[PDB]
Every structure is written in structure tokens, then in C-alpha cells.
Design a protein around this ligand. Structure first.
Ligand code: SAM
Ligand code: ZN
Ligand code: ZN
Ligand code: ZN
Ligand code: ZN
Length: 1135
């Protein structure tokens, strides 16, 4: 038996009937009392000992949505005076069956604890005080709900941009008062109250209306919305940073504003059925999809076609005649000057009108003037590239031109008029400067988006008549690309035996070792039964390319080649090689790769023949015994350095000793690291031996402290970068704390990874979004670069920095750098490829001052999964790429979760001891490198979060097999150990898309499985299999990774900052232990030396680590900067 009015079961042991006080009088008579007397018209009163009930007398909730379901709810209690704060029945009248509740409402989400609950009846408004004794429990739940909603709203007011893991932490960390009858809130609570908490958050946005992003569109909010099946639109209750800039950087972003700066409704929701004073009827479902789609980018496009190819229109027929004496003969007669009505000579710039279509106007430099054998008057046009046409596009000066590698021969007829083109050469004192017609400053490589300093030059008397930089460039590159023979010995048949050969600038002699693709050669080569679906209801969801092999290494035995005509055929150069085996290439296979050095090989008496084309590169394979420094010293002393100690017999499968023929300063830049963090980037740079961070700016206390702990001789300014620059600029010498502020000339290198959050969107710019970016940390960072003028500059960000705002963020960043006079470029890199068991891409912007060399991007060292290696960037329908050629392969095997952490001693959930013995030697190569040569007793930071008794129970129950997650959890009752019992999941609905179990059991956890609306209180909580997972699984790929364990042969899905099992940071459970990953494990996943110090509480340390640039990637970049210094160091020393 149930209620026809409210639906409560009569058998329900929690049912309670309405009990009235003697003094009970109807509403109109109560709203007549003398006892009774803020901008409203109703009126308003206080109300105590309240009780809400159905027409039949059952006590009822108000949250449950019965008021909306047209059910008349009535209330009774003691009304009081608007100002009377006494929650005791002593000042008012007792009312009974007070008018059907029109609506209920809340107020109090800002500067106050004024969380007031109010009722609206057809007669007056009521501010509820204390409930009645019998109503207390029902109002109790309602209170728990409201309190969570407050915490969430307040947290989001001070922290938009907050991620799911921040929300969960804010909640779990907030101590509820005694008044709220709950110990502490968990993710279970939030999930349980996901519908209420979300709707109140939507309601806060309707009510407190600005122009700001609604709080329900928060990253954490949308994460909750997607995780817990929640219906949006359920309507309810009611009641400017200025970036420190240099004028040059101000103007750049100020002109873009004054120049280039100028509906799929759901139908179904309650906002979509709400007409119409009111302007906002904004669909919340559309709002989410839009916010979600703003987060994703469009990551296989053809090469961008060269400009000026291209048709041009001929001109004049008046008078064109040579002026003066010829410069030289060649079948061609070169001349310096030429009349075309007016004068024209070598070095003058001309304009050429194309075919009148998409007609900008072509501009070139007159490189040469001559008259061929056919009497045709000619000129060599070395083409310029406009302000637009470069990656910069619209962002550029309509007068700035760029030198490109585009030149062609043309008749003097095609010339329109001579144009004035000025070189905006850097000053005598350029580094100190920070604070009409055509001009050019830099050289543009289309393919790589490299803006660089011009060659300057030089024209010899031997080629003074021809001098084309664009021709010289193509020559050098044709010359370096061609396979040429250095020295030959004695030719045999058609084969000419050689002692040395060359390509790409690399010189290959005999005995030198070589890199080759895995296909280049070969070595001596070598169902499932039914599950108990009662126990595993979710397993059915389980259903429903990996890294290449590192390079083949071979030693050169014979450079034989072939021949065509009479002289040596360069098209055919061949090599006979002694094959080397990597330990994995042996009968050892996977067991080789483990404890073995990444760097070790095996000598083989095997032989192979490959073409010189296939050769990927040159490496150094030495024999272990004939070495003068330690294997470690030799190995960590230069690139492509391999080694062998034994030889492998593929036949006998044995390890014999090898045969006897198998046998045989840098300037540290003064760096300023803005947004320094705990110091990852500085560390890799320090590791490259190219820098010394003397200044670091870090706004967050824990990170700045962790930086100091690792960089003792560094002035760490625990400040906001904007305020720090303002001081220097104001003329200040030291900060408040008496710390010496760096002045112009002090900074040689300025590097930094500003956080996104501000800009952080994909859709087109607008007055609102532009203003935020106009004062972003990217803008503050560019000013630091402007003011300081470092020899080198690095900006680091999330890969998507390159896609944000229709690539406008990247274009304005590059624009700025160019204005300032800097050679600059961008590129994407994958951490994984640099020796870290983690899949993470970063956008990297490189800039170097004129005088210096613009560095190339590092070549990948480790082979990584192709899917993780999409390094290309589309800007304005053009696919940009970096100098990286190793697409594809690499010299070393992939770093795995095993290589990363297999040595660390066992810990449990909530492991709190920061200093513990290792109780074991390193096992992997990577472990050896991160642990050091010198023995250290203390293992620091093998500390992991204390997960709730529910989450802990879940982790214990996730199997150990690779790729096991939530779907593997058993549907069993678990004693949590606090009296609390993790319950079995109830499947009471038909999942129409998923079908029945093998047993014929239902797969439905909510009514929405059947296509009907969600039935609340059909919602389950504190279950081992989370209810929210089956609930939304179908529309979210079954929540694949959730409660999933990292794989030993796998890697980290991303940079983890707060390990949460149903979070947005990928597989976070340890491969074997019933816990989430420890701080130190994340530190290892990042490639931090074990000596690296961290500061603060567990989460501050987790944040520190995950925010960091992995030192291996930082070192890779740092080592490209090494070449640039060494190269510019020698090119300085001369006559
Ligand atoms: C993602 S981290 C960069 C990581 C760092 N490059 C590393 O390798 O460790 C961003 C850092 O910038 C700091 N930050 C944010 N706003 C800042 C500001 N206005 N001035 C200085 N630092 C700021 C943050 O507290 C955070 O440490
Ligand atoms: Zn009832
Ligand atoms: Zn809608
Ligand atoms: Zn040329
Ligand atoms: Zn549902």
C-alpha cells in the first residue's frame, strides 16, 4: 500500500503522520495576528517548528519535486516577526494546513552564511527557522543537500577553471559543522546529490547574472554532469587584471583590437519551454556541448604549396635598353644597370602584377640583369613574401615583407615599377632598446615556420653579377642532400670499393656504425571461457597501433657501391655490415629489455647488405673492455653512443667473447625562469649544461619553496610576475624582501611555461575573450622578453596553445616576437619520445636574438606509439611542421611504467611516511639513471593519498591483469570497517541497447535504460560498482579507464596532478598495489632524479610534479640550444 497523493509506501518504516498543536489556526486568520507586521510585496515572516505534508497527512520532502509533479503540499508551525531570531515557539501564532506550497526557494550564495530556505504560498513568504521534532529528519537530508550546494557554489566563485579533482578535494576537505548530521563529505555524497547540487549551481547563474561564464559550465561541473546522469534545465530558487606591458607589446595587441576585432537549442528542457524584462532562455544542454566542443581541436593534410607559382602579366612596349658595359659573359651577357623609361640596377626592388584574380601584388629583388643568346632581355627575381602569406597572417604589418627561398628567371617585360625596400637592421644597442613604405627584417622558411636572421651574405667579385641568396640556399641543400663518395680504394667488377662516404653533412667511414629502419635486415627467428555474470555484471562492457622497433644497428665492413657510364654511380652506394643484436633481438626477447642498459648491444658475426639510402644516421658502437672511461661516463658523455661486451651466436644461442676485429668551455646562460614551478624545465636545462637559473618567479608558495630546495644559488621571487616587472620598470633595485631584481643585461635566457586558463579556448576571438587575452600571462611573458631582450627565449604550453582562438594566440605571440626583431619559430613535442613512460604533448615556442642561431627541435630518441606522435599544426588551412625527421623510429626502446617504477618498495593506501629505505637495488636502466651512481639511503615522497574506505575496497577488488578497470569489479557486499557496508548494485531496469546477461538478468540501473526519464531514488549510492558508471557508460565509451590500473608495459595517460579513479587524468591505480600512484611514482613518470626535492602537503607535491616540464624533454631542448652556443662561439673567433 502507497499514497495516492505523495506515493509513500504505508509499509515504509520511515513514514510519519502530521501531529498538530492545540493553537492550530488556518493561514488567512494567522496572517491577521498583531504579533506580525526585504524589498517585496507579500509579506514576509519567520517560521518555526515547521512540518510539510501531503493532503492525506504524510510528512514529505520538498527537494523530491512533488510540488512540480502538481502534488499539493501543506505546512504547519509557529509564524514569527521578520526580525525575530528566536527559533523557540514563544513569539508567534501556530498555523495549520498553510496554503498549497506555490514554490520553495533559497537565498545566500556570496558574502554570508545566510543559507535561508523559504516557502511561497498564495498568501505570503516564509523564512524557515528550525523544523518540528518529527520533521527534523526529513529537513535533515534537505539540509545536507543545501550545504554541499553552498560549498560547490562558493568554491566555484573564487575558482572557475577548477577541474573535477579540485572539486572532489574541496568537498572532502571541507569540515561540516555539528548542525549538519554527517561526519565528512565524499565524492559518493556529491554523486548521490549530483542532480540537486547541479541544479542549484545552474540556479545561481540565472539569479546572480553578470556577463561572466556561468558557474555550471566549469570544467569540474561538466565533469560531474557527464559522470552522474543529470538532467539540466530543472529551474529553481533565486532570493579587471591589467598585464604589466612594454608600449611595443601594448600597441601590438591594441592594434589587433582596433583592426582585426569584430542556436542549436534542445527544445525538450524546461529552459527550452520557458518564454521569453527577461532576455535569458539560454539552453543549458547546448551550453555544455558548446563548452565541451570548445575544449577539443582538429588534430594528414598535404604539404602547403609555394607562393608565386603563380601566373604574372606582361607590361610596357616603350623603351628598354641596357645602360653601360657588361659585367661578365656565361651564352648570357650580364649588365649592372638598365633603362625602362627610368633607371633600374642590381639590388633595386620591383613589383610584378599577377593575373588579375586573387591579386595582392608580387614583390622581388632584382638579383641579376642579362641578355640571352636569343636577344631576350632578362632578370632574376628573388621573391619576397608579404606580412600575411606567412604563418602570421592578418596579425602582421601591411608593410613587412619576408625573404623566402623563392626565385625565378623572368623577362624585363613582366616588371611593373621599381619599389623602395628597406632592411630594418637591428641597432648597435638592440639588447638595450626594450622600452611609410616597405621593409624587411627576417628570412621565412614556409615548411618549418622559421623566421630567421638574413645570411649577410656575401657577393664575391666572381659572382657579383648573379648574387642570389635564394639560389645559394637551394645549392647548399642540394649539396648536403646528395650521397657523395669521399675516398675510393680499388674498383672490382662494376663495384668501386671506398674508404669514406657522405650525406646530410654526416661523414661515414669504414668501421663506423650505422642506423637503419627495422625492415633493412633480419635476424635468426623463433580461446576464452565463460564469465560468471552474476558476480561480474559489468564485464560485458570490456568488449564492446603500438611503437615501431628501435633502429637496426650495423658496423660498416665494406662500402662497395655500383657504376653507370664511365664514372661512379652515386645513386647506388651499398654497405656490407656486421649485424648487432639488441638484447630483445636475442632469444631473450622481452626479458632482455628489462634490467639491461638501454644502450647495450651484442656483437654478431652475421652479415647484411643495404643501400646507402636506407641509412638513417651514424652512431658509436664501442667494445666495453677497450674503453678508457667508465661505461656510464662513455654513455652519458655524448649522443648515439652504444656498446657491446659479448658476442651472440644465433645458432648455439650462446654468449662467446667477441672476435679481435670487433675490437678498437660551454657558456652557461644566465636564465630567468618565469612561472618557474618546482623547477622541471630549469632542471633539464641545468642538465644540458647550457644554463644557470639565477632568477625564478613563482606565485605559489609550495612550488617556489621546492625550487629553492633544488636551486640554492637562485633568487626565487615568490611573487606574481606582473608586479615584479612593474618594479624593475619603475627603476627599483630590490624587492620588499630586499632581493636583488634583475636589470637589463643580467638575463641571457628567458624561459617559462605560463598556465593557460585565461585564453584557453578554441572558438574565434571576441571583445570579451580578447580583453582577457590582452592581459594574459602570455602578454606579460612577451613583455619580459621585450624589456630584458635575452639571447634566447622559450615559451612552453599545453599542445593546444597552437590551436587556441583559431590559432590567433600563436599568431599574435609570433607577431610580437617578430616586431621586437627576434628570429622565432614554434613546434610540438611528445614527452614519451624523450625517455619518459608518459604520453604528453607540449607546444614549444623558440626565439633567439639576432646575432645568435635559432635552434632546431630535438630529434626523438625513443620510439613511441604513432597515435601519441601527432606533431603537425594547421594554421589557416596550412600544415606546419618542425625540422624533426625521425617520424617514425628512434635509437632507443620505449620507457614503460615498469622501467619507471618497478623498484619502489610496497606501500599501502594512505601511506604517510616521507622518508623510507628503498629496501632494494634499482632494476631498470632508467631506475639506475634516476637513482644515481652514489648510493642514497632515503627514498623520498613514496607517499600516496588516503583514499576513502569505499574507494579502497574498490581498488582491492580491481584484478591485476593488464587493462583491468571498474568493469572487472565484483557485485558483492563489502564490509568497509566503519560499520558501513558497500552494497550490491541493483539491476531493476531493461537496458534496451545492451540486452540481457547470460543468466537473463537485467543490465539496467535507471529508467533511462528503457528510454524513459531518469527515476531518482532509483539512484543507488555507496555500492562497490559505482552506480554512475553503468548509468552513463553507454553514452561515454563505457568509462574505459575508470578504476583502471596502469600497465607495466604501458605509460601514464597524462601529466597526473591529483590521482582520482573516476577522474579526468587517465589510469591512476598502481599496476599491483591496492592504491593510487604515489607522488614519487609521478615524479619518476616525469623523469625527475630521485634527489629532486618537493615541498608542502601531499597534493601540493602532486600538483608540483604534474605541472612540471619533464627534465628529459627539458634536456633534449636544452641540447639543441647547446649546438647554437657552440656554433656561434666558433663563428665569432676570426681574422
Ligand atoms: C604549469 S607551471 C609551469 C611548470 C614549470 N615550467 C616547471 O617545469 O616546473 C605554471 C606555474 O605558474 C605559476 N603562476 C601562475 N600565475 C602566475 C603569475 N601571475 N606570476 C608568476 N607565476 C605564476 C603557478 O603558480 C604554476 O606554478
Ligand atoms: Zn501521502
Ligand atoms: Zn534546452
Ligand atoms: Zn636565385
Ligand atoms: Zn537515468
Amino acid at each position: 500500500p502507497k499514497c495516492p497523493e505523495c506515493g509513500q509506501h504505508l509499509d515504509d518504516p520511515n513514514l510519519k503522520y502530521q501531529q498538530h498543536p492545540e493553537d492550530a489556526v488556518d493561514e488567512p486568520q494567522m496572517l491577521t495576528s498583531e504579533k506580525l507586521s526585504t524589498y517585496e510585496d507579500s509579506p514576509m515572516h519567520r517560521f518555526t517548528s515547521f512540518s510539510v505534508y501531503c493532503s492525506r497527512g504524510h510528512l514529505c520532502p520538498v527537494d523530491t519535486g512533488l510540488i512540480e509533479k502538481n502534488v499539493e503540499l501543506y505546512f504547519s508551525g509557529c509564524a514569527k516577526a521578520i526580525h525575530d531570531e528566536n527559533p523557540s515557539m514563544e513569539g508567534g501564532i501556530n498555523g495549520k494546513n498553510l496554503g498549497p506550497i506555490n514554490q520553495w526557494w533559497l537565498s545566500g550564495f556570496d558574502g554570508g552564511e545566510k543559507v535561508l530556505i523559504g516557502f511561497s504560498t498564495a498568501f505570503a513568504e516564509y523564512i524557515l527557522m528550525e523544523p518540528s521534532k518529527e520533521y527534523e529528519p526529513i529537513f535533515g537530508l534537505m539540509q545536507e543537500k543545501i550545504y554541499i550546494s553552498k560549498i560547490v557554489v562558493e568554491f566555484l566563485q573564487n575558482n572557475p577553471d577548477a577541474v573535477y579533482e579540485d572539486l572532489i578535494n574541496k568537498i572532502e576537505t571541507t569540515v561540516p559543522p555539528s548542525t549538519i548530521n554527517v561526519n565528512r563529505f565524499t565524492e559518493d555524497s556529491l554523486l548521490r546529490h549530483a542532480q540537486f547540487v547541479v541544479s542549484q549551481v545552474e540556479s545561481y547563474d540565472e539569479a546572480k547574472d553578470d556577463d561572466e561564464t556561468p558557474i555550471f559550465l566549469s570544467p569540474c561541473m561538466r565533469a560531474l554532469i557527464h559522470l552522474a546522469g543529470v538532467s539540466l534545465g530543472q529551474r529553481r530558487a533565486t532570493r579587471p587584471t591589467k598585464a604589466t606591458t612594454t608600449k611595443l607589446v601594448y600597441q601590438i595587441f591594441d592594434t589587433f583590437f582596433s583592426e582585426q576585432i569584430e542556436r542549436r537549442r534542445c527544445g525538450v528542457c524546461e529552459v527550452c519551454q520557458q518564454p521569453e524584462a527577461c532576455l535569458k532562455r539560454r539552453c543549458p544542454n547546448l551550453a555544455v556541448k558548446e563548452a565541451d566542443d570548445d575544449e577539443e581541436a582538429d588534430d594528414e593534410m598535404p604539404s602547403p604549396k609555394k607562393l608565386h607559382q603563380g601566373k604574372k602579366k606582361k607590361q610596357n612596349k616603350d623603351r628598354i635598353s641596357w645602360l653601360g658595359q657588361p659585367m661578365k659573359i656565361e651564352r648570357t651577357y650580364y649588365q649592372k644597370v638598365s633603362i625602362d623609361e627610368e633607371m633600374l640596377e642590381v639590388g633595386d626592388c620591383v613589383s610584378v602584377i599577377p593575373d588579375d584574380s586573387s591579386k595582392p601584388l608580387y614583390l622581388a629583388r632584382v638579383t641579376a640583369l642579362w641578355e640571352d643568346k636569343n636577344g631576350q632581355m632578362m632578370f632574376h627575381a628573388h621573391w619576397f613574401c608579404a606580412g600575411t602569406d606567412t604563418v602570421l597572417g592578418a596579425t602582421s604589418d601591411p608593410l613587412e615583407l619576408f625573404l623566402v627561398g623563392e626565385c625565378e628567371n623572368m623577362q624585363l617585360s613582366y616588371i611593373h615599377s621599381k619599389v623602395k625596400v628597406i632592411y630594418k637592421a637591428p641597432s648597435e644597442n638592440w639588447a638595450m632598446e626594450g622600452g611609410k613604405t616597405y621593409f624587411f627584417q627576417l628570412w621565412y622558411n614556409q615548411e618549418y615556420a622559421r623566421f630567421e636572421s638574413p645570411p649577410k651574405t656575401q657577393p664575391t667579385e666572381d659572382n657579383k653579377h648573379k648574387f642570389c641568396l635564394s639560389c645559394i640556399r637551394l645549392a647548399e641543400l642540394r649539396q648536403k642532400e646528395m650521397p657523395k663518395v669521399l675516398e675510393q680504394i680499388e674498383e672490382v667488377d662494376g663495384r668501386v670499393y671506398c674508404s669514406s662516404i657522405t650525406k646530410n653533412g654526416v661523414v661515414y667511414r669504414l668501421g663506423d656504425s650505422v642506423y637503419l629502419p627495422p625492415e633493412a635486415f633480419t635476424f635468426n627467428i623463433k580461446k576464452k571461457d565463460p564469465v560468471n555474470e552474476t558476480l561480474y555484471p559489468e564485464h560485458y562492457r570490456k568488449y564492446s597501433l603500438d611503437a615501431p622497433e628501435p633502429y637496426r644497428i650495423g658496423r660498416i665492413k665494406e662500402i662497395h657501391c655500383g657504376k653507370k657510364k664511365g664514372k661512379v654511380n652515386e645513386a647506388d652506394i651499398k654497405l656490407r655490415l656486421y649485424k648487432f643484436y639488441r638484447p630483445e633481438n636475442t632469444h631473450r626477447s622481452y626479458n632482455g629489455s628489462y634490467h639491461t642498459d638501454i644502450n647495450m648491444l651484442y656483437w654478431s658475426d652475421e652479415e647484411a647488405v643495404v643501400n646507402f639510402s636506407d641509412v638513417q644516421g651514424r652512431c658509436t658502437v664501442e667494445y666495453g673492455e677497450d674503453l678508457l672511461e667508465s661505461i656510464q661516463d662513455y654513455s652519458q658523455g655524448g649522443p648515439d653512443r652504444f656498446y657491446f661486451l659479448e658476442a651472440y651466436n644465433s645458432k648455439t644461442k650462446n654468449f662467446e667473447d667477441p672476435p679481435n676485429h670487433a675490437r678498437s668551455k660551454l657558456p652557461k646562460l644566465r636564465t630567468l625562469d618565469v612561472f618557474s614551478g618546482c623547477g622541471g624545465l630549469s632542471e633539464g636545462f641545468h642538465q644540458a649544461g647550457i644554463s644557470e637559473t639565477l632568477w625564478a618567479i613563482e606565485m605559489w608558495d609550495p612550488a617556489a619553496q621546492a625550487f629553492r630546495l633544488n636551486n640554492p644559488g637562485t633568487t626565487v621571487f615568490t611573487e606574481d610576475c606582473n608586479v615584479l616587472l612593474k618594479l624593475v620598470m619603475a627603476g627599483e633595485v630590490t624587492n620588499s624582501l630586499g632581493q636583488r631584481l634583475p636589470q637589463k643585461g643580467d638575463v641571457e635566457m628567458l624561459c617559462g611555461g605560463p598556465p593557460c586558463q585565461g585564453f584557453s579556448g578554441m572558438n574565434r576571438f571576441n571583445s570579451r575573450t580578447y580583453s582577457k587575452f590582452k592581459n594574459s600571462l602570455v602578454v606579460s611573458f612577451l613583455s619580459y622578453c621585450d624589456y630584458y631582450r635575452p639571447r634566447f627565449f622559450l615559451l612552453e604550453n599545453v599542445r593546444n596553445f597552437v590551436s587556441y582562438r583559431r590559432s590567433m594566440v600563436l599568431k599574435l605571440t609570433l607577431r610580437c616576437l617578430v616586431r621586437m626583431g627576434y628570429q622565432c619559430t614554434f613546434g610540438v613535442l611528445q614527452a614519451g619520445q624523450y625517455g619518459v613512460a608518459q604520453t604528453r604533448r607540449r607546444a614549444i615556442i623558440l626565439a633567439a636574438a639576432p646575432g645568435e642561431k635559432l635552434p632546431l627541435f630535438p630529434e626523438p630518441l625513443h620510439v613511441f606509439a604513432p597515435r601519441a606522435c601527432q606533431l603537425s599544426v594547421v594554421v589557416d588551412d596550412k600544415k606546419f611542421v618542425s625540422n624533426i625527421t625521425r617520424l617514425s623510429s628512434g635509437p632507443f626502446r620505449t620507457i614503460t611504467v615498469r622501467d619507471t617504477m618497478s623498484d619502489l618498495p610496497e606501500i599501502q593506501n594512505g601511506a604517510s611516511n616521507s622518508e623510507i629505505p628503498y629496501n632494494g637495488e634499482p632494476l631498470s636502466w632508467f631506475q639506475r639513471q634516476l637513482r644515481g651512481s652514489h648510493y642514497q639511503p632515503i627514498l623520498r615522497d613514496h607517499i600516496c593519498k588516503d583514499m576513502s574506505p569505499l574507494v579502497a575496497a574498490r581498488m582491492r577488488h580491481i584484478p591485476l591483469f593488464p587493462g583491468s578497470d571498474w568493469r572487472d569489479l565484483p557485485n558483492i557486499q563489502v564490509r568497509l570497517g566503519d560499520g558501513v557496508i558497500a552494497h550490491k548494485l541493483q539491476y531493476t531496469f531493461h537496458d534496451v541497447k545492451n540486452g540481457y546477461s547470460s543468466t537473463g538478468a537485467l543490465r539496467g540501473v535507471c529508467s533511462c535504460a528503457e528510454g524513459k526519464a531518469c527515476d531518482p531514488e532509483s539512484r543507488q549510492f555507496s555500492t562497490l560498482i559505482p552506480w554512475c558508471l553503468p548509468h552513463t557508460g553507454n553514452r561515454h565509451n563505457h568509462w574505459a579507464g575508470l578504476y583502471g590500473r596502469l600497465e607495466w608495459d604501458g605509460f601514464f595517460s597524462t601529466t597526473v596532478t591529483n590521482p582520482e579513479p573516476m577522474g579526468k587524468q587517465g589510469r591512476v591505480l598502481h599496476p599491483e598495489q591496492h592504491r593510487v600512484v604515489s607522488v614519487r611514482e609521478c615524479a619518476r613518470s616525469q623523469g625527475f632524479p630521485d634527489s629532486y626535492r618537493f615541498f608542502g602537503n601531499i597534493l601540493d607535491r602532486h600538483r608540483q610534479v604534474g605541472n612540471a616540464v619533464p627534465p628529459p624533454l627539458a634536456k633534449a631542448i636544452g641540447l639543441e640550444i647547446k649546438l647554437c652556443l657552440l656554433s656561434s662561439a666558433r663563428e665569432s673567433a676570426s681574422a
